[PDB]
Design a protein that fits this description.
The complex is a heterodimer of chains A (4) and B (157). By secondary structure, chain A is mostly loops. Chain A is elongated. By secondary structure, chain B is of the alpha+beta class. Chain B has helices at 2-5, 12-32, 68-89, 95-117, 140-153; strands at residues 39-42, 46-53, 121-129, 133-134. In chain B, a hairpin with a 3-residue loop joins strand 1 and strand 2. Classes of the chains: A little secondary structure (4), B alpha+beta (157). Chain A binds chain B through residues 1-4, and chain B through 53, 55, 57-58, 72, 75-76, 79, 104, 107-108, 111, 121, 123, 136-139, 141-142, 145-146. Bound molecules: (2R)-2,3-dihydroxypropyl (9Z)-octadec-9-enoate (6 copies).
Chain lengths: 4, 157
């Protein structure tokens, strides 16, 4: 989901 | 009335709003900054930047580079589907969980859009404390994802  | 004939779907407009806000956020700092150039706002705590995270945090799982663009995009695709039916199942008055699902969904779709259009993910918020440490850059999508996780984690109390 997030950037990483 | 119209409010009930759509169900809990009108909550998607918060998802639509976050996606739009995050896409203009990226489009500004892209065409405004250079890669890793930082515009200092609070000299020792905060600045604007233009880092492109290719998802290189999980590089330890393979001796290739590029599969994060797909493994993570697929994650967002499937996760979004289970979070769409989850919002449909909710009821009136569960406005805490309706906001939380819309927040998490909106952010993940804004980063899924990145990985499907441009191989990386645009990030533009470098929170730091002097040269002591530098938190990784993120965007409005990460901000929406992180808030929605908090709202769900404080719904099990
Ligand atoms: C590159 C930027 C792309 C972003 C541009 C995307 C435009 C999509 C917006 C609206 C159409 C689909 C509506 C999606 C929201 C559904 C809301 C809903 O389900 O409720 C139905 C009814 O409108 C009760 O409000
Ligand atoms: C990343 C930060 C971006 C910030 C994004 C804003 C955060 C949302 C705040 C207020 C929602 C505005 C009100 C919109 C409510 C519409 C949804 C709705 O009314 O759903 C009714 C449903 O039918 C009942 O069962
Ligand atoms: C939180 C809900 C609010 C809505 C979400 C928006 C907030 C996101 C932050 C910034 C967006 C872009 C704002 C741009 C501000 C920086 C402009 C700038 O510093 O430009 C420097 C110029 O290049 C001269 O050197
Ligand atoms: C909790 C809700 C949070 C709401 C957050 C959304 C508000 C607007 C977005 C950022 C404000 C930060 C302001 C920083 C922009 C000023 C940049 C500037 O000072 O100009 C650039 C200059 O060249 C270098 O000093
Ligand atoms: C409210 C708006 C909601 C929008 C939500 C964002 C949608 C994400 C964008 C496309 C996904 C569709 C997948 C279609 C297949 C894309 C093919 C592709 O990934 O192209 C790769 C590249 O062009 C070759 O190197
Ligand atoms: C009604 C819903 C309101 C919606 C809330 C609007 C107010 C935003 C408040 C604070 C900003 C939150 C910023 C969260 C920062 C998360 C940083 C993060 O996700 O981690 C980055 C990671 O290191 C790399 O991927």
């Amino acid at each position: 989901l997030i950037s990483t | 009335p119209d409010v009930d004939r759509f169900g809990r779907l009108p909550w998607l407009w918060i998802t639509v709003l976050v996606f739009v806000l995050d896409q203009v956020s990226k489009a500004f700092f892209q065409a405004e900054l250079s890669m890793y150039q930082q515009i200092v706002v609070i000299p020792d705590l905060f600045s604007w930047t233009l880092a492109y995270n290719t998802g290189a945090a999980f590089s330890f799982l393979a001796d290739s580079s590029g599969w994060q663009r797909w493994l993570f995009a697929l994650i967002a695709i499937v996760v979004s589907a289970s979070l769409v039916v989850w919002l449909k199942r909710l009821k009136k008055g569960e406005t805490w969980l309706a906001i939380a699902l819309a927040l998490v969904l909106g952010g993940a779709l804004g980063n899924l859009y990145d990985r499907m259009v441009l191989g990386h993910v645009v990030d533009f918020i470098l929170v730091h404390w002097q040269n002591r440490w530098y938190f990784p850059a993120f965007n409005l999508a990460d901000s929406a994802i992180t808030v929605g996780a908090v709202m769900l984690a404080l719904d099990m109390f």
